[PDB]
Design an enzyme around this catalytic site. Structure first.
Site, mmCIF file in Angstrom:
data_model
loop_
_atom_site.group_PDB
_atom_site.id
_atom_site.type_symbol
_atom_site.label_atom_id
_atom_site.label_comp_id
_atom_site.label_asym_id
_atom_site.label_seq_id
_atom_site.Cartn_x
_atom_site.Cartn_y
_atom_site.Cartn_z
ATOM 1 N N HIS A 93 32.812 -0.551 25.454
ATOM 2 C CA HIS A 93 33.999 -1.484 26.147
ATOM 3 C C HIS A 93 34.997 -2.239 25.057
ATOM 4 O O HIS A 93 34.634 -1.903 23.788
ATOM 5 C CB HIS A 93 33.099 -2.555 26.859
ATOM 6 C CG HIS A 93 32.471 -3.329 25.769
ATOM 7 N ND1 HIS A 93 31.165 -3.218 25.205
ATOM 8 C CD2 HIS A 93 32.750 -4.661 25.058
ATOM 9 C CE1 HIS A 93 31.203 -3.870 24.222
ATOM 10 N NE2 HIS A 93 31.833 -4.732 24.124
ATOM 11 N N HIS A 140 39.286 -4.325 19.761
ATOM 12 C CA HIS A 140 38.619 -2.908 19.496
ATOM 13 C C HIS A 140 37.545 -2.797 20.450
ATOM 14 O O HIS A 140 36.930 -3.359 21.096
ATOM 15 C CB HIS A 140 37.772 -3.348 18.193
ATOM 16 C CG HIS A 140 36.988 -4.247 18.119
ATOM 17 N ND1 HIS A 140 37.024 -5.612 18.086
ATOM 18 C CD2 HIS A 140 35.362 -4.466 18.383
ATOM 19 C CE1 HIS A 140 35.977 -6.210 17.933
ATOM 20 N NE2 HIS A 140 34.821 -5.584 18.440
HETATM 21 N N1 LIG Z 1 23.611 -6.681 17.905
HETATM 22 C C1 LIG Z 1 24.867 -7.190 17.639
HETATM 23 N N2 LIG Z 1 25.319 -8.322 17.051
HETATM 24 C C2 LIG Z 1 26.646 -8.913 16.699
HETATM 25 N N3 LIG Z 1 27.523 -7.779 17.419
HETATM 26 C C3 LIG Z 1 27.100 -6.693 18.171
HETATM 27 C C4 LIG Z 1 25.936 -6.162 18.271
HETATM 28 N N4 LIG Z 1 25.901 -5.222 18.934
HETATM 29 C C5 LIG Z 1 27.089 -4.729 19.269
HETATM 30 N N5 LIG Z 1 27.941 -5.777 18.762
HETATM 31 C C6 LIG Z 1 29.494 -5.740 18.704
HETATM 32 O O1 LIG Z 1 30.086 -5.940 17.333
HETATM 33 C C7 LIG Z 1 31.171 -6.549 17.405
HETATM 34 C C8 LIG Z 1 31.201 -7.650 16.403
HETATM 35 O O2 LIG Z 1 30.029 -8.400 16.828
HETATM 36 C C9 LIG Z 1 31.317 -7.225 18.988
HETATM 37 O O3 LIG Z 1 32.358 -6.057 19.692
HETATM 38 C C10 LIG Z 1 29.953 -6.746 19.623
HETATM 39 O O4 LIG Z 1 29.991 -6.639 20.865
HETATM 40 P P1 LIG Z 1 30.569 -7.532 21.971
HETATM 41 O O5 LIG Z 1 31.911 -7.133 22.141
HETATM 42 O O6 LIG Z 1 29.914 -7.192 23.353
HETATM 43 O O7 LIG Z 1 30.498 -8.974 21.740
#
Ligand SMILES: Nc1ncnc2c1ncn2[C@@H]1O[C@H](CO)[C@@H](O)[C@H]1OP(=O)(O)O
Length: 213
Positions: free
Chosen positions: A144, A65
């Site tokens: 991303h 995702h």
């Molecule tokens: N503050 C946050 N805490 C947890 N997840 C976050 C977050 N901000 C963005 N995300 C994104 O939410 C999703 C679930 O955690 C992940 O894709 C994560 O990014 P990441 O891919 O860079 O880990």
């Protein structure tokens, strides 16, 4: 009141997920094998040859995702406000194509860089409390798909790591490509950071929706 998702985002189809996941793994096998990477291992880990597929041992179990807004079921700042937008409610369940322009690796995360369209950017959050890494860079730059992360890394890291890589490319510290892989040119950005700029951007199909977990 209504329970919001853990987060909103674009969930790739089975087929697109598989295609991207496989290109990520190929990239990790190629990079770990490349002289330029091996030569800089002392800057990647503080601890021979390192198998990156193993290094990024925490990987998505299934469909991949691209997150827009992390909501934490309403507890995150900006979540309610994001969820209530017409474009989010109208877009919920709709199909989009995401353009992947690059794959990257750092000591903490492996990911794919997404370049959103203007239509897609209407779904990118515009919050009050923003990070200093987003500062200066166009909205949606963080977008991303996470492909893996090292053992003790927390969620949110891949986006941070991307912004950092882009803040570097913005600085003109990208440097000449240090090799060419099948899919594009490879750049060493220092402090264990690597980027593959795909000659031909990948397109993945996805559905915009909310994940509860
Ligand atoms: N503050 C946050 N805490 C947890 N997840 C976050 C977050 N901000 C963005 N995300 C994104 O939410 C999703 C679930 O955690 C992940 O894709 C994560 O990014 P990441 O891919 O860079 O880990």
């Amino acid at each position: 009141k209504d329970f919001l998702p853990l987060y909103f985002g674009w969930f790739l189809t089975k087929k697109s997920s598989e295609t991207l996941r496989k290109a990520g793994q190929v990239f990790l096998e190629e990079l770990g094998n490349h002289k330029a990477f091996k030569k800089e291992l002392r800057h990647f880990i503080s601890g021979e040859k390192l198998e990156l597929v193993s290094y990024f041992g925490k990987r998505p179990p299934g469909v991949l995702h691209c997150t827009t807004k992390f909501c934490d079921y309403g507890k995150a700042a900006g979540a309610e406000e994001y969820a209530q937008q017409e474009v989010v409610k109208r877009s919920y369940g709709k199909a989009f194509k995401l353009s992947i322009s690059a794959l990257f690796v750092t000591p903490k995360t492996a990911g794919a860089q997404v370049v959103l369209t203007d239509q897609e950017l209407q779904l990118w959050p515009s919050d009050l409390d923003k990070p200093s890494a987003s500062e200066g860079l166009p909205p949606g730059s963080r977008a991303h798909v996470t492909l893996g992360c090292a053992a003790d890394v927390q969620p949110a890291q891949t986006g941070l790591d991307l912004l950092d890589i882009l803040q570097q490319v913005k600085g003109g510290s990208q440097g000449e490509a240090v090799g060419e892989l099948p899919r594009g040119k490879l750049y060493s950005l220092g402090k264990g950071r690597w980027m593959l700029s795909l000659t031909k951007k990948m397109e993945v199909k996805a559905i915009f929706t909310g994940y509860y977990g």
